[model samples]
Target chain A: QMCIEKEANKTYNCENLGLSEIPDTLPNTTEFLEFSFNFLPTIHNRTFSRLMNLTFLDLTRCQINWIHEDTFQSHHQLSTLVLTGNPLIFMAETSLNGPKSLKHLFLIQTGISNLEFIPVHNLENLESLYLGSNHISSIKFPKDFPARNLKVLDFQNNAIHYISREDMRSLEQAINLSLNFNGNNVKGIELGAFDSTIFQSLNFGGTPNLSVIFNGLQNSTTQSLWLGTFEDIDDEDISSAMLKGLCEMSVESLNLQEHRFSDISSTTFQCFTQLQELDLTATHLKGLPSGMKGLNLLKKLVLSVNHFDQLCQISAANFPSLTHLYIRGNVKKLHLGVGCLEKLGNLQTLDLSHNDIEASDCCSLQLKNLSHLQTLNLSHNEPLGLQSQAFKECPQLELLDLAFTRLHINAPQSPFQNLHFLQVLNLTYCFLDTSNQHLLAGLPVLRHLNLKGNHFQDGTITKTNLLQTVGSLEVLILSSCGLLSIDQQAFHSLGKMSHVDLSHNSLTCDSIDSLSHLKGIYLNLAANSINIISPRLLPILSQQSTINLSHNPLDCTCSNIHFLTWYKENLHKLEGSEETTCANPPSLRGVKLSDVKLSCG
Target chain B: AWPTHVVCSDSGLEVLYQSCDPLQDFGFSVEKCSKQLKSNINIRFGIILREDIKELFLDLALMSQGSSVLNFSYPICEAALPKFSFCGRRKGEQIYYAGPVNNPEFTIPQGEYQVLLELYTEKRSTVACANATIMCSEF
Candidate 1:
């Protein structure tokens, strides 16, 4: 039995259902139990002993091996326990003596080679411990393990080779911890082994001596720092004078992905002058050393996939308090150079996505001094020629992603009509010219309008003069728009619509009465060609809050008996109910409109 | 492994799934498709016709490490007298099936897949064809 209640009686999805126990009609007031791939090799004390109001228990890959003595003895309000990929061998000693509010513990790849089989007293309210890919080669812990209020200690891909200051004294009472020895093979680290610790994230992503982890972190203090490299470790090569041994550590977001920086000097990052987010994704750096100086408190600067071919060679006066600048995928075709980043006057979110960048008055001549730009991801990239007031110096713009680029719109001015605080506009597959009607006239406070795969040439939208000047729209993505006809006052002057994605169109059922005077929105007529659904469209799908008549071609006989009794009394405002089946009554082909059951006597 | 694209137009019909128990006739035993598709999939296989699946259609797609998460195309049976039980299958016949692919929403990110499928008819032609690989993992 695939237990699925998913919250009628408190969450349940007994996944994979090759069960062995715990299913006598689940509802012991179940509280989140997605018992993954079940089998339960062994967990005695009457397995989950009648659920005891279990509080989130996901036994993932349940071929669980053993846990006899007091196996959750009464499950005193368990708090998250996902025994991932279990092959776990034995856990007797009071087998986690009944929850005590166990706080997140997911023994990943549970063949745990040792952490004393993880059953130390009721864990004294443990707070997050995911012993990843375990062979657990020792992070020491177990001198009667208690870990005060442990704060996430995920020994990722563990085999932990070395880190002894007595393995950092069991995390020194665990206050701001967030450790994760990602793919551990850590060659050594004992000097100070994180002296005066105070972290909230530290993941030696691939572990292989940043000169013994910056000589054992001379002094710690973290807030996000993942020395990335694991894609099957490449022989470490980071340099700039071996990063001045991290100049006494004090990080704030630093992820050196696939390291190989090998000196780009001028005091490189001078030991990252109090860094503030600097992720050199795929660190294949091909530039960056201009007027190098201390990072003046950098703010989010991810030079994604390096080898830059221009963009002012990233010299932005060594980032004067920069704010979010991700040069995404610039292996070559870059060149958007006009004072390149004009010295980051506190830039605000500028991601040059995919970087096949080509400009023609684009980005107001390469973002002239940013003007505090607000979110501009040139999605995908290549052709770009917008002219009219083109972002007139950013004007505090708000979320503008030009999806798949190719935008050459000068069609009667309006390249974002000076952004006036624009709000989300991604022209997906941008071949937009949707009959131009002033192409969105001058978005005055636009609210999310992604014309996905644009195509309205005649597949009809009868009128509404191109969505009558925004009217402050609220999420309207016309998915796969080979749309059919729609004009019923096309969205009636948009009364603040709430998400109306006309998925994979070619609609029918009269386009659900052109969104029946829209109400609670979220209406996506999935893969249309909809067949019978007119019982007066059931109060317009009961004033929709969600509705995706999946792969529509539905005609579940009895002529769709009142939309199959209002889709079985609204399967919670249905959304892809098993592809909302029954293409026609040949007996009920492909079945499911919520398992069709009509009589039509 | 990405190289299979036979999107239709042949008419020969000779599909053949089950690259190792294709969900073992729906008793849920994929034995090798490396788990985790989370809910509803059944799919067993077979076919051989020379031309007769009345109106059919199938299409599938999948793929993994190399893009395409999932593709669609449905109508498993049409044209009058066919209700789904392998849709009026005929000519050279030997058509088996199993069906049940609810797929509420697909979750991907686990690797190894390819799938493909294809069937076709109603003039799109093909009529059969398959591909497998599969593998997935993780929850």
Candidate 2:
């Protein structure tokens, strides 16, 4: 017998059930089964022979061996087999005789030492094979392997020595395959073989050697390639010769980071004519080399966490076709140097966050040139003291994030007023002294507001023409505001609100009555100082589909018996209620509210 | 002033909470103790005990069973202690239970008991009894 939990759609967890053999109790309608953490030394041909509807099976860490052939042949719907962390010492040719529905499989750490030992004929429909952390020494597969639809091959963390010219032919049958050879020595990986494969993302990161690797790629193509090293040491200088072999590849996107190039020139990247996106993140380069724009299709560039002293110092004017630019984590760069972005006309998204720009005023003069810019992320910067005319010229901005920027808003003069198209505003953890009405009067189409970690001695808003001005408000995140109370009708006008997160505050039980008019769903009031669940607030809170009261100081005393009875009736609507504990009486302080016996007095 | 203090002390001073403990139970979990007094024309912590109100009530559960509270003094003023102490005076008033005292070898055993304390005028006339728990240790 199995302790099968017949859930929503026939799922079984027969783990550690003392089953000497595969449980026959699982229905033919079973869709998922996890028989791991048990003793199944031998899997005979008749093991999963009856369950034809089985889609997923995980027998991880089962100390399994002696797997018979045709074990999962009957289950035509079986798509994934996770035999991770098992000591699969014995495997018959028919042991892996899987169904046509098998799309993704993980045999990681299963002691599959040789590549030819695995049976590949039945895996005709296998889309991705994750054989990472195994003892296999080669990327080559057995002859007559019938995986015609295989799209991915991951051999990361294995003991493969080199990807040879012959080994590359083994993958000639697989099309559109995303290969990950991380932790494998690619020092002299005859690369011409890799450029021929269509990729979603191919990473050669654990090690690098541009000399031999590129010479091998002298005549291949890569849709997306990550040939950079993630090592802590500064190795492999990028010379013109190392950038030599890339001329043969019709590359589209490349993520080559941390490759400390000692010598660079305008022709350093001249070979990549088809390159559209390039990520040089953390290359420690202070500036780009003067060059011809060979990358005519280049649209996006990332140069974050580098040693650039200024934005204009980099080759921004060089990439005229660039549309998205990210220079997020710089060390010494401070000023915007007005009209710095006037060079690029197609630039839409610019992220210059986590830089050294501090104590600034009036963004209009600095960002006055970029009119087509739509999304700007300036979060985690120095106090960019914004003036009323700050965004007067950048009217196309849709999303602006200024979190933790110590934004000082001098009220009535709304600095972000000119941003008419802005829909999302993130002002988290900044000090504000202005009223909500004043700060929000300029934002006409604003739908989402994030004001977490900010509190004002005067930031409190009353019902006098406050949030009532913006009737289109949909999501408001006001958590951790140190709020003690709320004026009842202040939130009545925000009738269109749907999601609100007010966790981590000092709100009383009655302070939340302000949200009674909200027909909105998903209310989170976790981690507050609320102690009671009064009858008046209980029914009103049930209007929302989901509510989180997990960390509130709930009272489990006799006085709360009414709320206890009501809570048991509404389990689906309440989230994190198990963590909601009692705090009133001395004896019940550390006990859970649900575990307490609410005696009716 | 005496007549006004008597009337206010009757129903004005209410016990917000009595006993407490926490994980880092070095002291009160929520030691949010602010000394804000009520006032008609002024303010007073009027008609309070002559000793530590909390010290006397606490370890009351630790007191031995069957023993009753004596003048060992905060519901207090007890058989269990001057182990815990507290004192506040009305400007010119003198301190009570000043340190370097004895445990007085309370005859109390280790179990539960109740200690009722009466709040009164400075002259000890009319009384309002407050209930507190005492165990075998205080007996």
* Candidate of highest lDDT: 1
Local accuracy of candidate 2 as per-residue lDDT tens digits, A133-219: 987777778666755688888888888767787887877887677888777776567655565555566777756576676676665
Task: Evaluate residue A236 in candidate 2 and report its C-alpha lDDT on the 0 to 100 scale.
Answer: 74
Candidate 2 to truth, TM: 0.74
lDDT (C-alpha) at residue A24 in model 1: 82
**Candidate 2: residue A66 Cα off by (Å):** 2.9
lDDT of 1 by residue, A314-378 (tens): 77788888888888867678888875887888888988888898887776767886888789899
Of candidate 1 chain A, the 10-residue stretch with the lowest lDDT total is: A227-236
lDDT of each: 0.75, 0.68
**Against the true structure, whose TM-score is highest?**
2
C-alpha-based local distance difference test score of model 1:
0.75
